[PDB]
């Protein structure tokens, strides 16, 4: 939640420039992934080998998405003032998502 | 100047580290050059050969100073974002030193 940091107008513009500078922006849990999960779950046995293959399948896409996310967050962190960084870091310590 | 350069606090710290890292590094003794220049000017006749020797001595100090200056500016340039580099380059066109 960047919005509780009292972002300056300059910082709001800088965030826009960062988010345009790293926009993917991917959709919400691909239907294909869900359908593969569905096939594993709605079966009379749990197929662990099949499940492992399903879990691994989008590893490349996850890597690209998570790299973009982390780089974006790092860029935003670095436009913050020392006061804002302390608040961001305190908030980080309390959340688990 | 740094005119319209939106420096991150991380980059402002990096600049301080660069500028401290050049202000200490090599020696600066310039009063001797100035005193030799003074003695050429405040003399009953102009000694061209002596003046040429003073100028050549000054080239040593100029080299040291210019190398330090350019290296410092290069280090600063390389902490900048692409947007900031474009602004730095535009500003460079308007400044004289
Ligand atoms: Cl489904
Ligand atoms: Cl069956
Ligand atoms: Cl069966
Ligand atoms: Cl793989
Ligand atoms: Cl943490
Ligand atoms: Cl310069
Ligand atoms: Cl300069
Ligand atoms: Mg060096
Ligand atoms: Zn900007
Ligand atoms: Zn389904
Ligand atoms: Zn199915
Ligand atoms: Zn069966
Ligand atoms: Zn296993
Ligand atoms: Zn793998
Ligand atoms: Zn993200
Ligand atoms: Zn995150
Ligand atoms: Zn932490
Ligand atoms: Zn005299
Ligand atoms: Zn002479
Ligand atoms: Zn300089
Ligand atoms: Zn300069």
From Swiss-Prot, chains A, B:
Record text on subunit structure and interactions: Homodimer.
Biological processes, Gene Ontology terms: chaperone-mediated protein folding
Record localization: Periplasm
GO MF annotations in UniProt: protein folding chaperone; protein homodimerization activity; unfolded protein binding
Annotated phenotype, changing residue 69 to L: Increased chaperone activity, substrate affinity and chaperone flexibility
Main location: periplasm
Name of the featured protein: Periplasmic chaperone Spy
Annotated keywords: Chaperone, Periplasm, Signal, Stress response
Effect on the protein upon substituting residue 88 to I/L: Increased chaperone activity, substrate affinity and chaperone flexibility
Keyword Chaperone: yes
Family: Belongs to the CpxP/Spy family.
Role this protein plays: An ATP-independent periplasmic chaperone, decreases protein aggregation and helps protein refolding. Binds substrate over a large region of its convex inner surface. Substrate protein folds while it is bound to chaperone. Increasing Spy flexibility increases its substrate affinity and overall chaperone activity (shown for 3 different substrates). Protects proteins in vitro against tannin inactivation; tannins have antimicrobial activity. Overexpression enhances the stability of otherwise unstable periplasmic proteins.
Organism this protein belongs to: Escherichia coli (strain K12)
């Amino acid at each position: 939640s960047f919005k509780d940091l009292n972002l300056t107008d300059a910082q709001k513009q800088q965030i826009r420039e960062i988010m345009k500078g790293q926009r993917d922006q991917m959709k919400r849990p691909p239907l294909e992934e869900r359908r593969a999960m569905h096939d594993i779950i709605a079966s009379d046995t749990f197929d662990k080998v099949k499940a492992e293959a399903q879990i691994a399948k989008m590893e490349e896409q996850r890597k690209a998405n998570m790299l973009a996310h982390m780089e974006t967050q790092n860029k935003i962190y670095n436009i913050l003032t020392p006061e804002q960084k302390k608040q961001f870091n305190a908030n980080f310590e309390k959340r688990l998502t």
